[PDB]
Amino acid sequence: AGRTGRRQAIHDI
Amino acid sequence: GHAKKGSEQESVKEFLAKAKEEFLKKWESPNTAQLDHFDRIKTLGTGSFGRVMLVKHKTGNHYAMKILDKQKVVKLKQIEHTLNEKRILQAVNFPFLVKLEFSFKDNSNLYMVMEYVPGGEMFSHLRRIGRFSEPHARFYAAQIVLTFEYLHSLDLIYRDLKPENLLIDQQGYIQVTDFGFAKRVKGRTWTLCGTPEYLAPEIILSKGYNKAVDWWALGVLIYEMAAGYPPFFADQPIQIYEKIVSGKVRFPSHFSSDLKDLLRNLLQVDLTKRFGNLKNGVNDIKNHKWFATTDWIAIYQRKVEAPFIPKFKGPGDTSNFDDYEEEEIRVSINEKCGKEFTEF
Ligand SMILES: NC[C@@H](O)c1ccc(F)cc1
Structure with missing residues (x-):
């Protein structure tokens, strides 16, 4: 049970 | 033990020194x-x-x-x-x-x-077919290994490896795109950035970090290509982060033992033990048993038949x-x- 679609990168978490 | 390989290592050094001279001319101007x-x-x-x-x-x-x-x-x-x-x-x-x-x-x-x-993108082919065979995943992984060997030698870290950023060309080979996270780093760097499933633990823990985060991300990528999902897998980024920092990776029962051994050494929270980060550098990866069938020079020269050619x-x-x-x-x-x- 996790993310299956495209994943957004984060520039400053 | 387990002759050409050592002349091969001199040839790498020679290629990288020439690559650095071309890069620095364009980097300066x-x-x-x-x-x-x-x-x-x-x-x-x-x-x-x-x-x-x-x-x-x-x-x-x-x-x-x-x-x-x-x-x-x-x-x-x-x-x-x-x-x-x-x-x-x-x-x-x-x-x-x-x-x-x-x-x-x-x-x-x-x-x-x-x-x-x-x-x-590799992403949509992988999600459409489910998962790649180990030979298929190995062919792609070899190109990433060489690409990182090249980038790290120029002191560049890439910092967003994942199938979304890997395009398949007309010969079935990979083209890395999306350099938005890439950076020249001669020592460490400190920005908290990247894609949650692919972050190394030291990024998450707000530690200064180096090119070894790319090698951790290669472990995530190979696992996802061969399993169809990544090793730290959860609905919400905070849950993903907790899993990464424990680093308790479980593998599908169909993974070969050679693959699992490579992945345990890439997905290694202890940086004094993480492959790609040791005294032998990239060669601990290139000489791993899972890559024993890989002809590194033939991949570089694009002589190897690809697993599939997009229509x-x-x-x-x-x-x-x-x-x-x-x-x-x-x-x-x-x-x-x-x-x-x-x-x-
Ligand atoms: N993540 C890949 C997307 O940014 C992209 C799509 C197509 C392309 F030719 C380059 C990049």
Whole structure:
């Protein structure tokens, strides 16, 4: 049970 | 024990020293087109800061144009990262890195015009088929190993490896794109950035970190290519982060033991033990048993038959890309954020 679609990168978490 | 391999290591050194000299000439001495020179065809990918579009040079050649809205690139690190991407892409040259052709800006936007790679993202092929066989995944992984060996030798870290950023070309080979997180780092760096499932534990823990985060991400990528899902897998980023920092990886029962051994050494929270980060550097990966069938030079020279070749109907074919909502570009009468983007 996790993310299956495209994943957004984060520039400053 | 388990002759040519050592002459092979001298040849690597020789190639990398020549690569560094070419890179440094372009890095030291980096507005080569204009918007009206291109027709905009279809959006190929989107993000928080803009889109990448298929465009056609009004020469006829097709390109992938990344359009960044200067008014969305607002946070400090978002701005620095954009300058990194342009300066790195204009200076590197390698068979598995996308080629930047042109860059320019106007009142509203930054533009980076790259070669169009029509085979689609690895991401959609992998999600469509489920998972790749170990020989299939190995072929792609070998190209990433060589690409990182190249980038790290120039002191560049890549920092966003994942199937979304890997395009398949007309020969079935990979082209790495999306250098928005890439950076020249001779020691450590401190920005908390990347894609949650792919972050090494030291990033999450706010520790200064180095190129070893790329090798951890290679472990995530190989696992995802061979399993169809990544090793730290949860609904919410905070849950993903907890799993990563424990680093208690479980493997599918169909993974070979050679694959599991490589992955345990890449997905190693202890940096004094992580492959790619030790005294033998990349060679601990290249000489691992899971890669024993890999002809590194033949991959580099593109002599190896690819697992599959994407189907293409002609130039400008977009059939291997998903669809995205379109939004017309609006160039403001007034220049925006001219100060932040003066070096672009
Ligand atoms: N994540 C890949 C997306 O940004 C992209 C799509 C198509 C392309 F030719 C370049 C980049």
